[PDB]
Amino acid sequence: MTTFKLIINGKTLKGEITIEAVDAAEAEKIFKQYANDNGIDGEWTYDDATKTFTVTE
């Protein structure tokens, strides 16, 4: 069960949409694409302690 999350730290989007992926690396890609489709572009940080990223805008 590899469900990675993503906290959005910016005016665009705001939550932790959980998604499954081969590893956190792919999750960051799925998260880094899901953000563009909405307009989320800023910073990015992965949390290996909570399996959650952090996309700022």
List CB contacts of 42: < 8 A, sequence separation 6 or more: 9, 10, 55, 56, 57
Tell me how far apart the terminal alpha carbons of the chain are, to the nearest angstrom: 29
Cα 57 from Cα 51, distance rounded (Å): 20
Instruction: For the chain, list the strands marked E by DSSP.
Output: 3-9, 19-20, 52-56
Q: Compute the distance between CA of residue 57 and CA of residue 21 in angstroms, rounded to an integer.
A: 23
Identify how the structure was determined: NMR
Give residue 44's Cα distance to chain centre: 8
**In DSSP terms, which residues pair with 20 in a beta bridge?**
3
Residue found by looking up tokens 């959980």 in the block: 18
Check whether domain 1-57 has CATH 1.10.20.10, yes or no = no
Token couple for 24: 């956190």
The neighbour count for residue 2, using CB atoms within 10 Å, is: 12
CA–CA dist 45, 27 (Å, integer): 12
